Design a protein around this ligand. Structure first.
Ligand SMILES: *[C@@H]1O[C@H](CO)[C@@H](O[C@@H]2O[C@H](CO)[C@@H](O[C@@H]3O[C@H](CO[C@H]4O[C@H](CO)[C@@H](O)[C@H](O)[C@@H]4O)[C@@H](O)[C@H](O[C@H]4O[C@H](CO)[C@@H](O)[C@H](O)[C@@H]4O[C@@H]4O[C@H](CO)[C@@H](O)[C@H](O)[C@@H]4O)[C@@H]3O)[C@H](O)[C@H]2NC(C)=O)[C@H](O)[C@H]1NC(C)=O
Ligand SMILES: *[C@@H]1O[C@H](CO)[C@@H](O[C@@H]2O[C@H](CO)[C@@H](O[C@@H]3O[C@H](CO[C@H]4O[C@H](CO)[C@@H](O)[C@H](O)[C@@H]4O)[C@@H](O)[C@H](O[C@H]4O[C@H](CO)[C@@H](O)[C@H](O)[C@@H]4O[C@@H]4O[C@H](CO)[C@@H](O)[C@H](O)[C@@H]4O)[C@@H]3O)[C@H](O)[C@H]2NC(C)=O)[C@H](O)[C@H]1NC(C)=O
Ligand SMILES: *[C@@H]1O[C@H](CO)[C@@H](O[C@@H]2O[C@H](CO)[C@@H](O[C@@H]3O[C@H](CO[C@H]4O[C@H](CO)[C@@H](O)[C@H](O)[C@@H]4O)[C@@H](O)[C@H](O[C@H]4O[C@H](CO)[C@@H](O)[C@H](O)[C@@H]4O[C@@H]4O[C@H](CO)[C@@H](O)[C@H](O)[C@@H]4O)[C@@H]3O)[C@H](O)[C@H]2NC(C)=O)[C@H](O)[C@H]1NC(C)=O
Ligand SMILES: *[C@@H]1O[C@H](CO)[C@@H](O[C@@H]2O[C@H](CO)[C@@H](O[C@@H]3O[C@H](CO[C@H]4O[C@H](CO)[C@@H](O)[C@H](O)[C@@H]4O)[C@@H](O)[C@H](O[C@H]4O[C@H](CO)[C@@H](O)[C@H](O)[C@@H]4O[C@@H]4O[C@H](CO)[C@@H](O)[C@H](O)[C@@H]4O)[C@@H]3O)[C@H](O)[C@H]2NC(C)=O)[C@H](O)[C@H]1NC(C)=O
Ligand SMILES: *[C@@H]1O[C@H](CO)[C@@H](O[C@@H]2O[C@H](CO)[C@@H](O)[C@H](O)[C@H]2NC(C)=O)[C@H](O)[C@H]1NC(C)=O
Ligand SMILES: *[C@@H]1O[C@H](CO)[C@@H](O[C@@H]2O[C@H](CO)[C@@H](O)[C@H](O)[C@H]2NC(C)=O)[C@H](O)[C@H]1NC(C)=O
Ligand SMILES: *[C@@H]1O[C@H](CO)[C@@H](O[C@@H]2O[C@H](CO)[C@@H](O)[C@H](O)[C@H]2NC(C)=O)[C@H](O)[C@H]1NC(C)=O
Ligand SMILES: *[C@@H]1O[C@H](CO)[C@@H](O[C@@H]2O[C@H](CO)[C@@H](O)[C@H](O)[C@H]2NC(C)=O)[C@H](O)[C@H]1NC(C)=O
Ligand SMILES: *[C@@H]1O[C@H](CO)[C@@H](O[C@H]2O[C@H](CO)[C@@H](O)[C@H](O)[C@H]2NC(C)=O)[C@H](O)[C@H]1NC(C)=O
Ligand SMILES: CC(=O)Nc1ccc(C(=O)O)cc1N
Ligand SMILES: CC(=O)Nc1ccc(C(=O)O)cc1N
Ligand SMILES: CC(=O)Nc1ccc(C(=O)O)cc1N
Ligand SMILES: CC(=O)Nc1ccc(C(=O)O)cc1N
Ligand SMILES: [Ca+2]
Ligand SMILES: [Ca+2]
Ligand SMILES: [Ca+2]
Ligand SMILES: [Ca+2]
Lengths: 388, 388, 388, 388
């Protein structure tokens, strides 16, 4: 082998074509299916896998009660080929309530984090062996991407954050070769708060569109120079704006520089990416709840400090349906490299309360440069059919 | 590798020997088995797989209610090795309520179609990556083969149709290399209506025996020149005649040229193939319902404009049992290339109403040039044993 | 590759060491497990598989009622690695109520037989493709080994029988190269009746110890010359004697030549093999029912016309437990080639009637040239725990 | 290939990072999961597998009653990739109520032991074939490691014991090449009693830390010279002391030479390993029951005849939770070779009696040379949710 260096143009794109969907929640109504959440999908150089954090349990299981809770000793990183759902024959790849995987182009990397919330620990598993670990630097829930990392020439990159969600916290960027931490850099540039990044290979470095829980509903940006380990950070220019909750596109703002203090705390994992001067982005259809999903292009969304000019929209899930998290993945074609994405469709509690559990399913679309139509592909589970 | 060019004689044949059967419906009576329909089977250069459209659900599942409906956001293309049935550990290969797969002799192609009925979209997935897509040209249910495509030298061929089922509609033929559409040709020749084709490699081009919903109970023919992209279309000569519903072989007709207006609308997916001047064909045993299946040879069925001379008959499923769809697949031997076929045996609703779901099973036979006996191999599920 | 030519000495042996067991019946008491019978195990040049005839159903399944019956359209040849039991994720390899498999040392051969009892048909599947078939010559239940065939240099051998079980019937020996029948020879020598053979590679030819349903409780022998296709047949010399029912070893007889007319009809599948002049053999512990299993060596059992001198006995299943069929398999070591065997342990109806189904499990032992102890390894299922 | 010779330094280590956990017991509450106990994990040169002794049954199964009993004809050696739990699709690799596996660096070795307690027999399975066997030398429960063996240059080593648990018994050390016993050596040195060894490759020979049931709560040591087959045996120097039951570290003792007669009988499988002069070790947190697990380093624990100086502690399972067995496994890195371990967490009867079955789950940690935090990862199954 050689390593993945990702030196091809981004493919020009027109929108997004359907790719995959697993129907996980419908299946659990008469099936032995894992309770999960925070999915992602990533690809080795020949095929793609889906990943998720299990809740140490299946859905038709008295143990599935109260799985709203994010962190317990029984969450584990699941991995299957893209499209086969998480049944009992599924491999738990590590111990983890927070994770991130990628493939340098020889083996797989998994960064997995369990432990006490005040002194968690992250193990670095590469090609089978546990090659490294780190402890919690700020003693407050050590956490990572919940999506794909990226590797150029045998150096991978994850970004992690220890500290306060709704306050100043402590964000570093790890450079890791064959499972060994070979450099740590701290955040620079202007980004007030940088949780749950969605990263990708804009060749000679990496770019992430991340999540601000404190002061922002515009989304952060985190530039990583692969060669000398420099970092830069900003916010996306577009005044269309990526987070939930948010303000509404009459009364929305961003200057590409500072948070916006517009329902500026909480948030959700989401994604974006530049095209020359422009920006493709998705987001919930609701400004308030985590409902619906929509993509579009903003003209100028990358370059100019508040552009609200949107073309090529798409409704991936309709208004009247639930979604949740979301992120990006990149797959190299014969000539260019393409950008794809997934969205977690979460069901049950907090919101729906007829039942006592919390799980999700998924749907995935990939960038097309051709023609496409119109539709909407929700979870599709009648909660009345469901156990508990 | 080289590519599949299929340049070998057709094997001379005497009839058909059993090959496979999956018992899918019996198994669901105490098992966790997918709800499907429209199967097919196709083969990579070393083994064969079975394919079907799932209904986003399993049979012992409140969600299985009302699965008569053909198109929803949760249908997905399943794929297993030929003979292992669709359990929970099965990979959903794409999003689709209409499909077609083949293997050029390096990778797999899948053409998958979901969306709104008025503006569906078809994704082209080859070797993992989404390489292309197209939108709905006539804004009325974009649809395809529901069986195997065929590839010669790295150019594959699918035929698709947008428009009216019971009226004039819009039929084109796509030429696609490594997942990229490289040519589209429209239908020519005399065929009034060309749904659900069963295609195959009569070397230097491809031949399909298709389905007419509008004016015909004789079956269409669709010749495809692989080299310059010409098309021709006609109807099968034989007055024995392939569709259901149909007229009965005293009062049946075809001239090889025009539809026959003999209970000439609806139809079913079915197959045929020439042998010099002759025709091997199968069909339901019933002229009225989709019941029983039988094969035979018509002497002159290919060449002469109404031949009703049949030899080598075979009853694959008896009169008193249900069938449904059906199609052909081709597998290359050491010296010649052989032709095989499958039949979808569908159970439950509309017809049987004790239960509320709709699924099928399958049986598959391959062409033999040797001896054979007599039998009949139906689904075999006691509907009273069944859930719902 | 080259082909399997099996030119190594038989390993000298002291007895038999345990090898495998699948616990299939216990598992079905809370599991989704196939209803089967007539097992065998055979090995490709790197690992071993278990095979069985399914009943188109699983055990906790209203469809499992009345599965005493041997022949229906839903029996199918199952295949797994040795030790993983027949769950829902198991591949049905062909249509068959009678079968036999082997591996020439490049691909797998399966001979599968379904159809009407008066005009069955046997398909020949080699390396995926259906390469050949034959019809029923005597129009009375065409049937085969229900155990491993054997191949030397790319010519395999199965022996099959059409005709009467309890009367004269019609027995031939097929020679088949890459799935093509290349020679058929009829039975010669002295064997009055030759059902269910257990064959094996005594180098330059093959030897089978078979089953006589008509006139014999001594077991037949069927010698096959691989080079010119000659056949010879006799009975085993030993007066210890291999069938059930049988007479008891005070009042037992064989002359190596003719049947013995000693409770001489019915029978069971069983096995044996020469060692110089001696014979290793197993059989039920009961002369009357198919209960218990025991192995031992007879001194002179091969050469001398009624030897009742037995050493090295072993109780594989105790008197107070059920068994059934049984057969041999051969695996080549680094220096010699070894002989191993399996026994079908059948449960439920006819005999046990608390329940309405009929299935089995298995246990397998291999020849050792070392030390060993004492035990007994039965099915082990409490019928009261069982469904139905 | 070449063979595994394990000639690399031990990796210096700081402690242990989490690696894996399978959640087996929680899953059985709505899942089809094997009843087991005595796990271990071992690795081929590219990945790791988990192993366990099944009880011929699954947990939601009337057959699971009374599975406290250690030895029956239905125990079987299970094997999966590390992290996928023992479902119905799991391969039973041999017949066994006592076992040990390893991989010489070309194939897998399994030593499996079933039979009568007074005349058991151990089969030696290597690379598929049964290559050898031995009988019971002392006619009292022949037994082995219940963890990983180790192989240097194509000679493997298991240590086995026949005789009395609570008395003098008969302990030998087998040297075995490609499944053939090529040398047997008896125990020498000072070790009064040597059950259930945990062995590992301290290059040119092997070292085991074993279990004394008779006179000791300090743990034995069993040195094996790979070159001429010499043996030595002692006890661990540390006065901290490894067994359960034990005396408490105020009133604890060891001189590295003789048993200690301090609650000196029974015991549990456990592990340790030298580092220069020091000792890393784990043990239950309870001196009385098999509850909790903790690791730490003893300064001088290797070299000096009663050292009670402990640094680097870790609580792997908390006081208020159950554990059981435990052992070590070694995996070679790029430069050094690392040492890892697993602990069996056992649930149900004897102790918990609301239910009638006995199974376990597992958790596994690997040696890190980096940073780490704090936590505790128990089985996590609410016994009230459980069947029976
Ligand atoms: C590729 O594919 C599509 C396939 O659909 C091509 O065009 C399609 O055009 C129709 C045009 O109307 C469009 O349907 C419309 O949009 C809404 C869809 O469903 C909503 O329902 C709930 C609401 O929360 C959500 O789940 C979901 O997210 C949507 O918001 C319909 O609401 C809408 O109906 C109303 O308006 C139409 C005119 O647009 C009127 O015909 C009706 O009267 C109705 O409302 C009534 O009258 C007035 C005015 O609306 C009021 O008093 C009140 O509203 C009253 O009840 C409408 O029919 C399809 O979904 C289109 N799809 C897309 C994707 O455009 C598409 O162009 C093609 N294109 C590309 C670019 O790929
Ligand atoms: C390889 O294998 C076969 C193995 O069967 C070889 O030959 C077999 O020959 C017999 C000859 O009769 C044939 O059975 C006949 O065909 C019908 C089969 O079942 C039907 O049942 C229902 C009806 O809807 C459907 O499910 C199914 O699709 C079939 O239609 C039988 O109906 C028929 O019985 C009647 O006729 C026979 C004479 O043929 C009489 O013996 C009876 O009396 C009976 O009817 C009665 O008498 C008269 C006249 O029929 C009337 O008053 C009224 O009908 C009354 O009740 C018949 O027994 C096997 O299936 C043959 N099979 C094949 C495949 O040919 C075969 O030749 C060999 N060949 C090759 C070429 O491979
Ligand atoms: C490797 O392993 C074995 C491990 O067992 C080594 O030797 C063992 O020696 C004992 C010796 O007795 C043997 O047990 C005997 O055999 C019978 C086993 O169980 C039966 O039970 C039912 C009956 O249908 C069946 O399920 C099953 O197939 C067997 O037939 C016992 O029946 C027998 O008990 C009676 O006889 C003994 C003396 O042999 C007396 O101690 C008792 O009194 C009892 O019967 C009573 O007294 C008299 C005379 O018997 C009568 O009034 C009446 O019977 C009354 O109740 C006996 O204990 C182990 O199984 C041996 N095993 C083998 C494999 O030999 C073995 O040698 C070693 N060897 C090698 C060669 O590998
Ligand atoms: C990496 O991670 C850890 C993350 O926890 C870093 O430090 C942590 O520091 C706290 C300090 O207190 C420690 O918690 C303590 O230890 C016990 C943990 O739980 C027990 O509960 C049951 C008891 O059987 C078992 O299941 C289990 O095995 C443990 O034994 C607590 O018992 C303890 O609480 C009591 O003492 C504290 C002071 O230590 C007081 O705050 C309370 O008042 C309480 O008891 C009360 O007051 C007095 C004195 O105790 C008495 O009257 C009576 O006890 C009364 O109720 C305590 O809070 C975390 O678990 C630490 N973890 C570790 C791993 O050290 C850690 O340093 C960092 N380090 C490294 C080296 O990796
Ligand atoms: C980035 O990746 C590919 C991976 O090998 C490099 O591949 C070389 O690129 C061309 C044609 O692909 C030539 O430079 C070499 O002879 C190619 N080898 C192969 C196997 O493709 C590419 O050059 C690398 N680029 C950078 C910028 O490092
Ligand atoms: C069609 O396919 C096969 C695939 O390689 C071609 O194979 C060649 O055919 C013969 C013998 O098979 C010779 O022409 C070549 O040396 C063969 N190569 C191999 C690997 O078989 C065949 O010629 C191709 N035919 C056409 C008409 O394109
Ligand atoms: C039977 O089988 C083996 C399979 O190749 C033959 O192998 C040859 O036998 C020896 C050493 O094994 C030499 O004759 C050849 O150079 C060997 N080749 C290999 C790959 O082993 C063996 O000779 C064949 N015997 C007969 C009697 O045909
Ligand atoms: C132990 O194992 C390795 C396995 O091959 C041996 O490898 C050799 O070691 C070095 C570099 O690894 C050189 O001696 C050889 O050219 C190497 N070959 C490979 C494939 O690594 C190592 O020497 C063996 N050592 C002992 C002490 O036997
Ligand atoms: C990734 O690796 C290659 C290693 O060569 C880098 O490629 C350029 O690398 C050198 C620059 O010091 C040149 O000597 C090479 O010709 C050229 N490589 C090719 C294969 O085109 C590249 O800089 C590295 N990229 C990063 C982000 O570190
Ligand atoms: C496990 C963890 O703390 N990561 C998270 C995942 C999801 C959510 C969430 O938005 O519900 C929050 C957090 N913090
Ligand atoms: C999904 C789809 O529209 N294709 C079809 C499949 C089956 C039938 C059918 O004949 O029931 C009809 C159609 N149109
Ligand atoms: C299917 C078939 O006819 N072969 C058989 C298998 C088992 C038995 C049996 O002994 O129950 C009999 C037969 N004839
Ligand atoms: C099967 C067997 O005898 N080995 C054992 C395993 C566990 C225990 C145990 O400690 O419960 C004891 C023994 N002897
Ligand atoms: Ca925010
Ligand atoms: Ca029609
Ligand atoms: Ca007989
Ligand atoms: Ca002790």
């Amino acid at each position: 082998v050689e390593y993945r260096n990702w030196s091809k143009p981004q493919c020009q794109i027109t929108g997004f074509a359907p790719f995959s969907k697993d129907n996980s929640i419908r299946l659990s109504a008469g099936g032995d299916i894992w309770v999960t959440r925070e999915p992602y999908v990533s690809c080795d150089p020949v095929k793609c896998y889906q990943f998720a954090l299990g809740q140490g349990t299946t859905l038709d299981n008295k143990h599935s009660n109260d799985t709203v809770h994010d962190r317990i000793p029984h969450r584990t990183l699941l991995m299957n080929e893209l499209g086969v759902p998480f049944h009992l024959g599924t491999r738990q790849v590590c111990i983890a309530w927070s994770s991130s995987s990628c493939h340098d182009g020889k083996a797989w990397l998994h960064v997995c984090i369990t432990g006490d919330d005040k002194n968690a620990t992250a193990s670095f598993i590469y090609d089978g062996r546990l090659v490294d670990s780190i402890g919690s630097w700020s003693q407050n829930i050590l956490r990572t991407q919940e999506s794909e990392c990226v590797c150029i020439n045998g150096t991978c990159t994850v970004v992690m954050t220890d500290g306060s969600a709704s306050g100043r916290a402590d964000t570093r960027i790890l450079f890791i070769e064959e499972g060994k931490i070979v450099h740590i850099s701290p955040l620079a540039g202007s980004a007030q708060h940088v949780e749950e990044c969605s990263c990708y290979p804009r060749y000679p470095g990496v770019r992430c569109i991340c999540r601000d829980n404190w002061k922002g509903s515009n989304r952060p940006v985190v530039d990583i120079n692969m060669e000398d380990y420099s970092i830069d950070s900003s916010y996306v220019c577009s005044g269309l704006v990526g987070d939930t909750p948010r303000n509404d596109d009459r009364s929305s703002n961003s200057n590409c520089r500072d948070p916006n203090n517009e329902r500026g705390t909480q948030g959700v994992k989401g994604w974006a990416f530049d095209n020359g001067n422009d920006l493709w982005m998705g987001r919930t259809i609701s400004k308030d709840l985590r409902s619906g999903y929509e993509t579009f292009k903003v003209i100028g969304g990358w370059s100019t400090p508040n552009s609200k000019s949107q073309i090529n929209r798409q409704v991936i899930v309709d208004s009247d349906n639930r979604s949740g998290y979301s992120g990006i993945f990149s797959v190299e074609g014969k000539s260019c490299i393409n950008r794809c994405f997934y969205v977690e469709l979460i069901r049950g509690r907090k919101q729906e309360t007829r039942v006592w559990w919390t799980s999700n399913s998924i749907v995935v679309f990939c960038g097309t440069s051709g023609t496409y139509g119109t539709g909407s592909w929700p979870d599709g589970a009648n909660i009345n059919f469901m156990p508990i």
